[PDB]
Design a protein around this nucleic acid. Structure first.
Ligand SMILES: C[C@@H]1CCO[C@H]2Cn3cc(C(=O)NCc4ccc(F)cc4F)c(=O)c(O)c3C(=O)N12
Ligand SMILES: C[C@@H]1CCO[C@H]2Cn3cc(C(=O)NCc4ccc(F)cc4F)c(=O)c(O)c3C(=O)N12
Ligand SMILES: [Mg+2]
Ligand SMILES: [Mg+2]
Ligand SMILES: [Mg+2]
Ligand SMILES: [Mg+2]
Ligand SMILES: [Zn+2]
Ligand SMILES: [Zn+2]
Lengths: 66, 47, 261, 242, 261, 47, 66, 242
DNA sequence: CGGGAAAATCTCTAGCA
DNA sequence: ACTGCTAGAGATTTTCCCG
DNA sequence: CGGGAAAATCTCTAGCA
DNA sequence: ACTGCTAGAGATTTTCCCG
C-alpha cells in the first residue's frame, strides 16, 4: 500500500545546487517533495533543497537498464 | 545598519552609500535618496 | 599606532592607499588599515565576486528576442530541460510577443516567464495575454542579461546551429525551425544524457507523478512527531533521521529525541 | 533475481506484461521483457493526424496527436504547400513526429511538404480529426469575443482544449496524456536500445554451449539457455562478442 | 554497428548531431561517433579551452595607448613588477611613441617591447628608435588583446585611480601623473607585499646580483659529470640530485649513477 | 599530419582545414592556401 | 670562497608558473640561473623553469626580519 | 644565535657594521643592528638635484640623483612653474623622491612647484649638477647629428649617460648604481619598520625585570637586559605590549 | 593540547573596448 | 614562429596565543 | 590483484551584444 | 523584493577486463 509509494518516490533522481556553487550536484535520491522544498539523500547525507534549485527526473534510460 | 555602494545598471560610476532594505541570494534592494533600487550583488558592496 | 592613524588618514585623503600600503607604512594593524580604507567613499569601487543562480522550477520559461540577417527571432527556453521554441517574427512588438506566448502556453504548461525589459515584453498586450493564460511575469534587474543567462546561451547555441544548417534552407524561418528541431532532438547530453525534448518530457512527467504519489502518501501517512518542542507533521523517516515540518519550517532531526505518535 | 521463477509463474497465470513484473518482483526490464517474450500464447505515440478547417473565411491548420487527442493549431494565410510544410517543420521540431495522416489534397501532397517530411524523417499516409475539429470550433466560438483577431481565439481554444478540458479514465488533460504517452515511448525506445546492445553477445558458463546475455550486473549474470533463464556468478562465466 | 555508421553519416549530413546523439541512436561506440563528428567541417566551431601565459622576463615591457576625456594616454608596464609609466600624448602617432620609448629606455633597462599592431607602434619611427636603443619589438597576434593582458589590466587600474584623484587636479595630464605615482608607490600587494616601485627595484637588483654570483661560481666551479652518457657540465648538486647541462639540455638526475670528475 | 580549424582574428566564421606548421604553448602557425597565419590556441582546433 | 656564493644564490626567492596553470607558485629557492632556464627547489622538489616564466626577487622585507 | 658573543667580539675589534655581522655569523638584522648600536665609539638615496640648462635656444630641465649620478632630463617649452611642477610630479611618480635641491630661481620657488612638492611629499632646499650638466651637453653634442629635433638628442644623451658610460669602483652605470642604492634603501626602511614594530614590547624571562624584545623565532627569543643581549627559550618567557 | 583570533591563502569578478 | 591579467571582496584553511 | 583501456568526471572557454 | 549559462575540448580520475 504505502511502502510501494515511498520506494517509488525513492526511484526519482534529483539534481540540485547550493547557495554559492555553480556546479550541479550529482543525482541524489528523492525522499519527500513539497510545494517549495525537496528533501533528498545525497551520499548518505540528508539535505533539504529549495524547489527552485532542484531538477527532478526519473532517468528513463537508467531505469530500463535496471 | 549597512551602507551599500553599487554600480547602477549601465552607468560605470559607483554610487552610494545607500541603505540596505533587503538582501537576497544574488541581489539586494537599496534606498538612495528616496529611490528604491534592485542591484545585483555583483554590482554592489555592503559595509 | 594611535599617532599613525592620523597620518594614514591624511595620506589616504591624497593617494587613496590600499590597506596594505597604509599598514606597511604607518605601522598599523591590518584591521585598522582596512577600517581606514573602508570609510572612504572614493574607494568603494568593486562589487562582490560571485554569481547568483537563476530559478529552475519546472514551470519557468525564459524569453528573449535576438537578431539574425535583419530579422527578429523570438526565442523561449524551458529552464529546467533546455527545450527551446523559436520563431522568426516580423517585429519586436507586443502583439507578436503576446501571440507567441499564447501559443507556447497552449502547448506546454507555463507558470512563470522571465524576460528583460524590452518594450515587446513590457507591453500591456503581453500582460493581458499572460493574465488570460495565468502566467506570472518576472522582470530581471534592468540591464542584467545574467538574470537570463539560460535564454542568452540558448541564443548563442540556436545561432550556431542556424549557421550550420543555413545552406539547407531558402528562407531564414526554415533554417530557424530546422535549428529548433536539431537542438531539441539531435543533441544529447546534460543530466540524463538526454535530448532537450526527452528531458522536458521527463521533467513534466516526473512532476505529475511525484505530486500524485505525495498526495497519496500524505492522505495515508498521518502522524504527529514531538522532538527535543511541540507537535510536528512527519514528512519522511529512515536510517536514523526524521525530517519533519513544524510551523512551515522543515528540519531534519536524528531518530533519537524524536517520538512519533 | 531470486523471484525469476515467481515471475515466470505469474506470467503463466495472468499473461501480464513485462512492466508488471519489473514493478512487482524487482527485475531488470530486459529480463522481464524476456519472460514475457517466451510465451507465444501471450502475443501510436508518433502518429499525428492533420487536416485543414475553414472559419470566418480563414483556414485553420489542425494537427491532432491521436493517441492522446492533444491538438496543435494555427491560422495560416493560405492552403498552400509552403504553409503546410512550415507547419509540419514546426510540429516535428517540438514533438517527436513519426507519421502524418492527411486527406487527399494539394497542400498535403506537395513536393515542398514532401521535402519537409523527408528532411524531418516523417512518413506520410493518405474520424478523429473531424470530431476534434468540431470541438476546436466549439471552443473558438466560446471564446471568440475575448479576442479581436481570429488567430488569438484559435490559440485560446488550443489552450483550453489542451489544458482546461478534462476527461477519460482519471480525468487528465490532453497535455497530461501526451506527456505520459511520450514518456512511455522514451522508456520503450530505451529498453529497445538495451536489448539491441546486449543481443550481440554470447555467454559461456560453468563449458556449456552459447547462451544469450540478458542482464549483466555486479555479482551476477542473467542469461538464457534452451528457453530457460538462469543466473550464474560472474567469476564462473565468460562473455564474448558475436 | 557497421550498418549504423552509414545511417549515422546520412543523418549527421542533415542535423549535424553531436557524438552522444549518434551513439545513443545508431548504437555506435563512443569512439566511432566521435570520429563521425570529427570529420565534418561544419562542426569544427570551437577552440581550445585554455589560456596562454605571457612572457615575464625582467627586461620586457608591454606598451599600449588608451583614451580618456578625448586625450590619448600612452602607457607602459614592466611585466615582472607591475611598474607603470604613462603620459598624456597629443596624438597616437609614431613620433610621439618613439619619443616616449626613447625616454623609457633611458630610464630603465628595456630589452623587448610587446605591443599590438596599432599604427603608432608599427611605425618606422618607433622601429628606428627601438633600433637605436637596442630594443626588440614583439607584436602579438592581430586583434588578440589577451597577448597584452598585463598592459590592458593596467589600463583598467590606471583609469580607476585617475577617476579617484581627478578632482585633485585641473588638467588630465596632472591627474595621470598622480595616478602613476599612486600606483607605483601607494599600493602594496603581490608577490612580496611590495609596491610596484619597490618590486621593480628588487627585480632589477636581483637580476644584476644573481648574474654576477653565477659568473663567479662558473669561473670557480669547473667540473665534468658522467651519468648513466658522455660528459656534462655540472650546474648545481645537493640532497641526492645533480642538475647537469649536456648539449644545451638541462636535466636533473639522482646522485646515484652520476660521477663527478 | 594535422588539420587545423581556426577563428581568424575578427571574423566570427570558422575557417579550415589548414596545415599545422608549428605548435607552441599558446599559439599555432598554420598554412591555409599559401597564407601563413599565427592563431591563438583559444581560436583554433587541431585534429 | 665558493660555498658563500652557493648559499647567497640560495637566499633568492623564485616565483614561477607551469605550462597550463595560471596561478603563480609560491616562493621556491634559487639553485642555478642561466640565460634561459632557472633551476629551483619547490618543497624538496627540484624543478627546472623557463626564464620567461620565473620572477626572481630577494623579499627585502623577509630578509630584514630574518 | 650561538655566535652572538663572537659578533660582539668582532664589533669590538674592527667596528664593522650590522650588515657584516648578518652576512657573516648568520644573525637576524635586528640583533646585528642592536650589537652595532650598543657601542657609542662606533657612532641620500632620495635627494635629487634640479637645475635648468639652455641649449640652442631651448631649456633643458635636468634632475640628478646625487648618490648615484643618475640623470633624468627633458626639454621643456618654457622655464615656468607649470613645467617645473609637471617635471617634478613625473619624477616622483617614478623614483622615490624625498628632497629636491634647487637654486634661487622663479620656476623652482613657485606656488605651483610648491603645491606639487606638497602633494608628493617632497621637501625643497634652496657642484654636482654643474659638472653633470657639462657631461650631458657633451653627449648631446656627440649625438646631435643622429636626431633632428633637440629633444631626441637630449633623450639619447640621457640613455648614453645612464647606461652606456661606466666608471667608479667596479665600473657600473648610473642605472646600476641607483638601482643598488634604492635597493639598499628599501632594505633600510624595512629594518626600520621591524625595529619600530618590536620596540613596543617588553619581555619577562626566567621573573626578571622588563627586557627589550629584539628577535622572536620558532624556539628562541633574543632579548636585551642591562645592555647584554641574551637568548632564552620561548616556553620560559612571556611577551607583553607596552 | 585546544579553542579563539588573526593571518594567510583561496576563489572569483570586471574591465581592459 | 606565441601565449590573459590584476587587484579587491568574501570564504576557507593555516598559524598563533596562551591557558 | 594490476596494468591497459575505456568511460566518466573535471576544467575551462566564447558568446550570448 | 533576486540571482550566469551552455556545450564542447582536452585533462584527470574512476571504472572495468581479463590474465
Ligand atoms: C532593449 C532590451 C532591454 C534592455 O537592454 C537591452 C539591451 N540588451 C543587451 C544584451 C547583451 O548585452 N547580451 C550580452 C551578454 C553579456 C553577458 C551575459 F551574461 C549575457 C549576455 F547575453 C541582450 O542580450 C539583450 O536581450 C538586450 C535587450 O533585449 N535589451
Ligand atoms: C588599432 C589598434 C590595433 C588593432 O586592434 C585595435 C583595436 N583594440 C581593441 C582593444 C580591446 O578590445 N580591449 C578589451 C579587452 C578584451 C579582452 C582582453 F583580454 C583584454 C582587453 F583589453 C584594445 O585594448 C586595444 O589596445 C585595441 C588597439 O589598440 N587597436
Ligand atoms: Mg532582450
Ligand atoms: Mg539577450
Ligand atoms: Mg592598443
Ligand atoms: Mg589595449
Ligand atoms: Zn579612499
Ligand atoms: Zn557536422
Amino acid at each position: 500500500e504505502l511502502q510501494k509509494q515511498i520506494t517509488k518516490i525513492q526511484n526519482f533522481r534529483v539534481y540540485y545546487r547550493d547557495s554559492r556553487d555553480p556546479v550541479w550536484k550529482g543525482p541524489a535520491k528523492l525522499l519527500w517533495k513539497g510545494e517549495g522544498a525537496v528533501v533528498i539523500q545525497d551520499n548518505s547525507d540528508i539535505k533539504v533543497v529549495p524547489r527552485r534549485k532542484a531538477k527532478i527526473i526519473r532517468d528513463y534510460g537508467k531505469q530500463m537498464a535496471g | 545598519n549597512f551602507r551599500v555602494y553599487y554600480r547602477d545598471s549601465r552607468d560605470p560610476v559607483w554610487k552610494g552609500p545607500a541603505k540596505l532594505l533587503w538582501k537576497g541570494e544574488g541581489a539586494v534592494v537599496i534606498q538612495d535618496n528616496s529611490d528604491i533600487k534592485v542591484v545585483p550583488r555583483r554590482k554592489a558592496k555592503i559595509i | 599606532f594611535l599617532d599613525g592613524i592620523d597620518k594614514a588618514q591624511e595620506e589616504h585623503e591624497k593617494y587613496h592607499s590600499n590597506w596594505r600600503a597604509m599598514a606597511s607604512d604607518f605601522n598599523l594593524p591590518p584591521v585598522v588599515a582596512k577600517e581606514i580604507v573602508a570609510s572612504c567613499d572614493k574607494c568603494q569601487l568593486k562589487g562582490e565576486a560571485m554569481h547568483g543562480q537563476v530559478d529552475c522550477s519546472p514551470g519557468i520559461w525564459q524569453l528573449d528576442c535576438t537578431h539574425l540577417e535583419g530579422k527578429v527571432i523570438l526565442v523561449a527556453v524551458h529552464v529546467a530541460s533546455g527545450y527551446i521554441e523559436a520563431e522568426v517574427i516580423p517585429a519586436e512588438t507586443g502583439q507578436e510577443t503576446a501571440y507567441f506566448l499564447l501559443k507556447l502556453a497552449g502547448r506546454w504548461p507555463v507558470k512563470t516567464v522571465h524576460t528583460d525589459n524590452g518594450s515587446n515584453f513590457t507591453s500591456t498586450t503581453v500582460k493581458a495575454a499572460c493574465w488570460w493564460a495565468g502566467i506570472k511575469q518576472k522582470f530581471g534587474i534592468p540591464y542584467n542579461p545574467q538574470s537570463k543567462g539560460v535564454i542568452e546561451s540558448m541564443n548563442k547555441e540556436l545561432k550556431k546551429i542556424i549557421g550550420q544548417v543555413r545552406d539547407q534552407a531558402e528562407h531564414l524561418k526554415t533554417a530557424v525551425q530546422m535549428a529548433v528541431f536539431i537542438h531539441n532532438f539531435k543533441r544529447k547530453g546534460g543530466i540524463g544524457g538526454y535530448s532537450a525534448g526527452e528531458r522536458i518530457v521527463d521533467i513534466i512527467a516526473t512532476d505529475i507523478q511525484t505530486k500524485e504519489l505525495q498526495k497519496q502518501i500524505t492522505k495515508i501517512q498521518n502522524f504527529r512527531v514531538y522532538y527535543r518542542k511541540g507537535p510536528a507533521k512527519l514528512l519522511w523517516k529512515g536510517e536514523g533521521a526524521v525530517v519533519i515540518q513544524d510551523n512551515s519550517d522543515i528540519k531534519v532531526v536524528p531518530r533519537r529525541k524524536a517520538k512519533i505518535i
